[PDB]
Amino acid sequence: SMTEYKLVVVGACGVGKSALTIQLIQNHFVDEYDPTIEDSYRKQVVIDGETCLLDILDTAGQEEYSAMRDQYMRTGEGFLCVFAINNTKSFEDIHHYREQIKRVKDSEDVPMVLVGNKCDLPSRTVDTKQAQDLARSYGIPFIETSAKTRQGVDDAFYTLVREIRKHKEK
Amino acid sequence: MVNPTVFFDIAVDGEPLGRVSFELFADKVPKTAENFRALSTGEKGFGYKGSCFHRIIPGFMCQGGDFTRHNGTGGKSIYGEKFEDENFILKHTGPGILSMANAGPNTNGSQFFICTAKTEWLDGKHVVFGKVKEGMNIVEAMERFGSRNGKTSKKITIADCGQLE
Ligand SMILES: CCn1c(-c2cc(N3CCN(C4CC4)CC3)cnc2[C@H](C)OC)c2c3cc(ccc31)-c1csc(n1)C[C@H](NC(=O)[C@H]1[C@@H]3COC[C@@H]31)C(=O)N1CCC[C@H](N1)C(=O)OCC(C)(C)C2
Ligand SMILES: Nc1nc2c(ncn2[C@@H]2O[C@H](COP(=O)(O)OP(=O)(O)NP(=O)(O)O)[C@@H](O)[C@H]2O)c(=O)[nH]1
Ligand SMILES: [Mg+2]
């Protein structure tokens, strides 16, 4: 059967992990704030001419439960690390997620994409160059998104699948 | 100040399960207790009657109180959409504790949770304002229909509610 990819979406509360995931899966924008406990979704897609099954874990941004993330980090194959362009704290939180993934997986080669979300909003506080430099230092792609307008949504998840494919064949 | 007592009659897919009553600690958190009391009687013209427990996580808590959107994101207090954290005198010491849900500091509305275990990491973040008096076994029975992420497998509603004392 088609290959399944276990993707995990991580980042601070409110950055739009659920809004991005629900746009990908359900093609609508959730304007209300329903902070996540943990949700899973499945979708078949075609990426570079190859049909595959996305298994997406949408995680909580709650700072209180950082120790509870190790389990799903061991299970996940690739990680979307999401911050909001109008939330500098969420960008600073990215480093801790990346380091936690690197620690739990014991690898620098974990498939990962840095996602700067909410690019439809006017109040930018994280410079695009800041995020580009960080992604380059990690050696991972950087994608700007808006769950509200759908800009970059497919690109973010599909790029992560491409990173997993490169990793499985390296 | 005397602590009032309120009750919920809980239903599962519209069928009666049982009554849970709560002592409200008006002697420590009068404004928070009064909000829950008034929402339980419906005397302001809105409140808990007919709303559901949207999140039940066995081993932890049952959460409800969204009578405005019925989707876990809503609710409102008798003071406006949100009100301040009154104090954190009382702690999440064990099963039966009744405490305010929130989305960060000073965002109390109507959503609340009933603990089914000690949840001490919520101390100082969620305002505790009551405790189950009678019907803890009904709160336990509500855990029959919860799940790891809280999604319920049957519709758990407050069929009726009001004040006893
Ligand atoms: C990491 C997984 N995980 C856990 C958790 C944690 C643990 N531990 C931590 C503690 N360890 C001890 C120190 C050793 C043991 C292991 C074990 N297993 C789990 C669960 C079952 O694994 C899936 C939780 C938890 C809680 C959240 C997100 C993820 C969570 C979360 C999201 S939103 C919120 N929390 C606050 C929420 N806000 C709103 O709903 C806002 C909505 C909008 O505005 C009005 C309305 C709110 O007020 N409450 C009212 C209060 C209880 C609270 N919900 C809730 O549901 O807690 C669930 C739970 C299980 C108690 C905690
Ligand atoms: N303007 C705008 N708002 C967005 C965007 N993405 C999410 N939001 C809004 O930001 C809020 C939080 O979104 P949500 O997807 O719940 O964030 P989350 O990262 O899943 N939070 P949690 O970690 O608590 O589950 C919601 O009100 C949502 O509508 C976006 O791209 N643009
Ligand atoms: Mg979410």
Residue numbers in the entry:
A (entry chain A): 0 to 169
B (entry chain D): 1 to 165
Excerpt from the publication:
RAS family genes encode small GTPase proteins that regulate cell proliferation in response to growth factor stimuli. Here we describe RMC-7977, a reversible, tri-complex RAS inhibitor with broad-spectrum activity for the active state of both mutant and wild-type KRAS, NRAS and HRAS variants (a RAS(ON) multi-selective inhibitor). The binary CYPA–compound complex then binds to active RAS (with dissociation constant Kd2) to form a tri-complex structure in which CYPA sterically occludes RAS–effector interactions. Although neither RMC-7977 nor CYPA alone exhibited any measurable binding to GMPPNP–KRAS, RMC-7977 makes multiple π–π and hydrophobic contacts with RAS in the switch I (SWI) and SWII region once the tri-complex is formed.
Kd2 values for the most common oncogenic RAS variants were all within threefold of those for wild-type proteins. No binding was observed for GDP-bound KRAS(G12C) in vitro, and stabilization of GDP-bound KRAS(G12C) with adagrasib treatment prevented KRAS(G12C)–RMC-7977–CYPA tri-complex formation in cells. Similar potencies were observed for inhibition of RALGDS, PI3Kα and SOS1 binding to KRAS(G12C), KRAS(G12V) or KRAS(G12D), as well as SOS1 binding to wild-type KRAS. In KRASG12V and KRASG12C cells, inhibition of additional markers, including phosphorylation of RAF, ERK and the ERK substrate RSK, was demonstrated. In these cells, there was evidence of durable pathway suppression and apoptosis induction after 48 h of treatment, indicated by sustained pERK, pCRAF and pRSK suppression and moderately increased PARP cleavage. Additionally, RMC-7977 inhibited the growth of KRASG12C cancer models that are resistant to KRAS(G12C) inhibitors owing to restoration of RAS pathway signalling. Overexpression of wild-type or mutant RTKs in NCI-H358 cells (KRASG12C, NSCLC) conferred reduced sensitivity to adagrasib (proliferation inhibition EC50 shift: wild-type EGFR, 42-fold; EGFRA289, 153-fold; HER, 51-fold; FGFR, 18-fold, RETM918, 34-fold), but not to RMC-7977 (proliferation inhibition EC50 shift ≤ 3-fold). Furthermore, we demonstrate that concurrent inhibition of multiple oncogenic RAS variants and wild-type RAS in the same tumour cell with a reversible broad-spectrum RASMULTI inhibitor such as RMC-7977 can overcome some of the resistance mechanisms recognized to limit the efficacy and durability for inactive-state KRAS(G12C) inhibitors.
